[PDB]
Structures are given as structure tokens and as C-alpha cells.
Design a protein around this ligand. Structure first.
Ligand SMILES: Cc1cc2nc3c(=O)[nH]c(=O)nc-3n(C[C@H](O)[C@H](O)[C@H](O)COP(=O)(O)OP(=O)(O)OC[C@H]3O[C@@H](n4cnc5c(N)ncnc54)[C@H](O)[C@@H]3O)c2cc1C
Length: 447
């Protein structure tokens, strides 16, 4: 059986791993159009901030190691087209220019997404950078120590834009973050959390310019100004972190696509065509908090979909269990984590929720190490089933969100969590820990 896997990033990589333990026998070709196998773009912040010194070690696999395991790795080789009826792909070797047709028994594609660019006047003056992959990681690092870079502007106030803002502020630059949305990180966190985080970033001289539409980049040769509908900002460097486009225009006409460009797949990762499976950022995933399919571009999703595509290679036998959208990050001193439905998700989905927020020290009063923690529990008004939760503290309490993700998937209620058995020991928590305490508040509010 011959399986061709497209992409060496999180989705393609786990499809090769599960192929190796479920079909050791198979002939596996692994294709990557780029030059570097399995660079971890998730580790770009650690590298930019100097925590990791070698950019080439920010990876989780090499072609050499996969070849020791019997996989045929083809880097600098692009899949140009798929011919799904005859079960063939056309591939182009990018160093020699040679094209060739390859036949397959099963095809798994994880083509990913590309950084979205603002296509506005000034579009590319030099020093308007993107943040994805090795090459952009290297170029961004060189700018961190450039004495000519004093002002950096990042467009986008989501996860990636805040990682770039923190890394340039820690390198000693003045950073302005611009976005049309009214709060940074609103897709992950509600206003009581992003209000604290906005103060924290402003303390580290990051200006957050919310509610503005970038109109043009100005400059001579290279960027010098970013002008919005409301203002103009000096910029020696712009990082555009506004979002991501699915890398699928080459597939139009071959596979069914949704209007926004994402590949249509069912719960077995099957596309519209027999024997080709699609996984990763270019797909929708079952989202258990709201029982619907949502595009949640996270590495954890691509990895699980990649293994489920191999489980369903022969027969649709193993429907995907669905995910809660869990994410986590440190922003200067704060470590936050969230899962499930928050305010912006409930809006998008037209879902009504109730929520309690507790802010208090997470250790008992006599303990000198005590610190404030914020915890918000979101639940269904009718059933009181748990729908989401967000937590933040300068202490790392983030592993508690792993219990809430399971609570959502098992459809537990506020009462289940108010009395759930969580350990107590006074150097670690209070007799009713952070989850218990917020669920006890919710039970009282519904009494
Ligand atoms: C800066 C940054 C920080 C992030 N941090 C986190 C984090 O901390 N936690 C988390 O869960 N997620 C994080 N993510 C999201 C995560 O990186 C993505 O969800 C995940 O990489 C998607 O995997 P993928 O396989 O779908 O696609 P991609 O990573 O986009 O990879 C697609 C791969 O396929 C290759 N390819 C595409 N087309 C072809 C072709 N036709 N022929 C051959 N090869 C091709 C591409 O070159 C690329 O190597 C982050 C993303 C970024 C950019």
C-alpha cells in the first residue's frame, strides 16, 4: 500500500507517525516544498527572546531520522496538483525543475495556511515582515538587534501579534500594536482578563491602538509610517499578524472547498474525493462546546486529525471525538489559559451563556507566597453544563484548564465541579481549589 503525505508540519508529521505504527509495511512518501523539515513556528518566540540560541534546533523531526525509519522524505519537492480519479499527483522538484507524476493508494494532505497580507498602498516597501516559518524567524531575529530599528508596529492583536509585540519590547524597542478589534486577545479571553493584560503591556511600553483600520504604509524604499483612518505611526519595522489564509487555491476544482477556502472533510477526515484525506489549518474541526464545526488553527488539532486520518485509511471506523479549542500563553508576568466558549465565541455562534468570575489569592491567607488568580467559568443557562473557562495569574495554574476541557467533553455541570475531588495541600492551593471555588459561586447564583 503506498501512502503519500503532503507537508512536514504538525498535521503531515503525525500522519506519518501513525502510519508507522499502524501500517509498518506501507511505502510512505513524505513531501515538503520547503527546505527545512518540521520547523516549529510555535517556538519562534523562545528563539526571538534569546531563550533558545540555535534556530535550527527549534524543530521536532529531521528527514534523516524519518529515512532511518524507512520513509522517503522529499524536501524541496512541491505537489503541484492532485488527479483524484486516477490516483496520481504531479510533483515538482524545486532544485532541478523536474516534474513527475506519482501514483498513490491513499493521499493525506496537510497543506496549512499562509500569513494574510494587507493589500494596501505601500504593500511592500522593505521591512514589512510576516511571522511564520524559519526564514521569517531568522529575519525577525536580526531586526531585534538592529540599532536602526527603534519603532516597530505590529498589526493584529491576537496570539501571534502579542508574541511579536512582547519579543520586540523585550529587545528594547518601542512597539505599537494596531487592530480593528477593540481588545487584544479577545478570541481567547474576555474583558476582565484583557484589561489586566493591557495594563501589563503598557507598563512595558507597548501602545495598544484598538479600533483603527490601517490604510497605507508610507516610506521611501522602506517603511517609515503606517497610517490608519485615525492616526499615523512611525514604524521602522512592521510585523503583519492579522491572520492566516488556507493554502488551498491550487485545489479549487479538485476537491470541494467551503466559500472561505477551507477543505470540506467529514468526521473521518475524508475529502469529497475517494482516498484523499485532509487535516490541519486548512480544515474545520468538530468543536464540542457548541456541537458544530469551527476552524481552530492550533497545532494540537492538526496532530490529532493527522492520526485520525490514518485510523480511517481503509474504513471510516473511528469518528473524531472533537476538541474544545484549548490554548495557553505567558504575556510578560501573566500566564493564562482558556478553553471552550468565551464572549467572542458565543457572539459568533449565537449561543447564550452565564458566567461567574472569581479573583482572589489562590493560597490561604497565612501563606506568604500567595498571589491573585482570575478564574471565569462559563456555563449553559438551562442545563448548567460547563461550556468554557479562562484563568490567569502570575503563578502558573494553567494545567487546571486541562480539567475543564475534559469537564466540557463529558458534559459535566457546575454542581459536578463544585464538589469534584481535587487535592488540597496548603503550599499548592486552598481547601476548595480554583475550579471548586468558581463552581461553588455558580451554584449559589443558580440557587
Ligand atoms: C508564530 C506561531 C505560533 C503558534 N503557536 C502555537 C502554539 O503555541 N500552540 C498551538 O497549538 N499552535 C500554535 N500555532 C498554530 C500551529 O502552528 C498550526 O495550527 C499548525 O502548524 C498547522 O499545521 P498544518 O500541518 O495544518 O500546517 P502548516 O504548519 O501551515 O504547515 C503546512 C506545511 O505543508 C507544506 N506545503 C504546503 N503546500 C505544499 C505542497 N503543495 N507541496 C508540498 N508541501 C507543501 C508547507 O511548506 C508547510 O511546511 C502557532 C502558529 C504560529 C505561526
Amino acid at each position: 500500500m503506498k501512502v503519500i503525505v503532503l507537508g512536514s508540519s504538525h498535521g503531515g508529521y503525525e500522519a506519518v507517525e501513525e502510519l508507522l505504527n499502524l501500517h509498518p509495511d506501507a511505502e510512505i512518501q513524505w513531501y515538503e516544498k520547503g527546505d527545512f523539515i518540521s520547523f516549529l513556528s510555535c517556538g519562534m518566540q523562545l528563539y526571538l527572546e534569546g531563550k533558545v540560541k540555535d534556530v535550527n534546533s527549534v524543530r521536532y523531526m529531521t528527514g534523516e531520522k524519518m529515512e532511518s525509519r524507512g520513509v522517503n522524505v522529499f524536501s524541496n519537492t512541491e505537489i503541484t496538483a492532485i488527479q483524484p480519479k486516477e490516483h496520481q499527483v504531479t510533483v515538482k522538484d524545486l532544485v532541478s525543475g523536474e516534474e513527475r507524476v506519482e501514483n498513490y493508494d491513499k493521499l493525506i494532505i496537510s497543506p496549512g495556511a499562509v500569513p494574510f497580507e494587507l493589500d494596501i498602498p505601500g504593500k511592500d516597501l522593505d521591512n514589512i515582515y510576516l511571522m511564520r516559518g524559519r526564514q521569517w524567524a531568522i529575519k525577525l531575529k536580526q531586526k531585534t538587534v538592529d540599532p536602526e530599528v527603534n519603532n516597530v508596529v505590529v498589526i493584529g492583536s491576537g496570539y501571534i501579534g502579542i508574541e511579536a509585540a512582547e519579543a520586540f519590547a523585550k529587545a528594547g524597542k518601542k512597539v505599537t500594536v494596531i487592530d480593528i478589534l477593540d481588545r487584544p486577545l479577545g478570541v481567547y479571553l474576555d474583558k476582565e482578563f484583557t484589561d489586566v493584560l493591557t495594563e501589563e503591556m503598557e507598563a512595558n511600553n507597548i501602545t495598544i491602538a484598538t479600533g483603527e483600520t490601517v490604510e497605507r504604509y508610507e516610506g521611501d524604499g522602506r517603511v517609515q509610517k503606517v497610517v490608519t483612518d485615525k492616526n499615523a505611526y512611525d514604524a521602522d519595522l512592521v510585523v503583519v499578524a492579522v491572520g492566516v489564509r488556507p493554502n488551498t487555491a491550487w485545489l479549487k476544482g479538485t476537491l470541494e472547498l467551503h466559500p472561505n477556502g477551507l477543505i470540506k472533510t467529514d468526521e473521518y477526515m475524508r475529502t469529497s474525493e475517494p482516498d484523499v484525506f485532509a487535516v490541519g489549518d486548512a480544515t474545520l474541526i468538530k468543536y464540542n462546546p457548541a456541537d458544530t464545526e469551527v476552524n481552530i488553527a492550533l497545532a494540537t488539532n492538526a496532530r490529532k486529525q493527522g492520526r485520525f486520518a490514518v485510523k480511517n485509511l481503509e474504513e471510516p471506523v473511528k469518528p473524531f471525538p472533537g476538541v474544545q479549542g484549548s490554548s495557553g500563553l505567558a504575556v510578560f508576568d501573566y500566564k493564562f489559559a482558556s478553553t471552550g466558549i468565551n464572549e467572542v465565541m458565543a457572539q459568533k455562534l449565537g449561543k447564550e451563556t452565564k458566567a461567574v468570575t472569581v479573583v482572589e489569592d489562590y493560597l490561604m491567607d497565612f501563606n506568604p507566597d500567595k498571589q491573585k488568580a482570575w478564574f471565569k467559568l462559563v456555563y449553559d443557562p438551562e442545563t448548567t453544563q460547563i461550556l468554557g473557562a479562562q484563568l490567569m495569574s502570575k503563578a502558573d495554574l494553567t494545567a487546571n484548564i486541562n480539567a475543564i476541557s475534559l469537564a466540557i467533553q463529558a458534559k459535566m455541570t457546575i454542581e459536578d465541579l463544585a464538589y469534584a475531588d481535587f487535592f488540597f495541600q496548603p503550599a499548592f492551593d486552598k481547601p476548595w481549589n480554583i475550579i471548586n471555588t468558581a463552581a461553588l459561586e455558580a451554584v449559589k447564583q443558580e440557587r
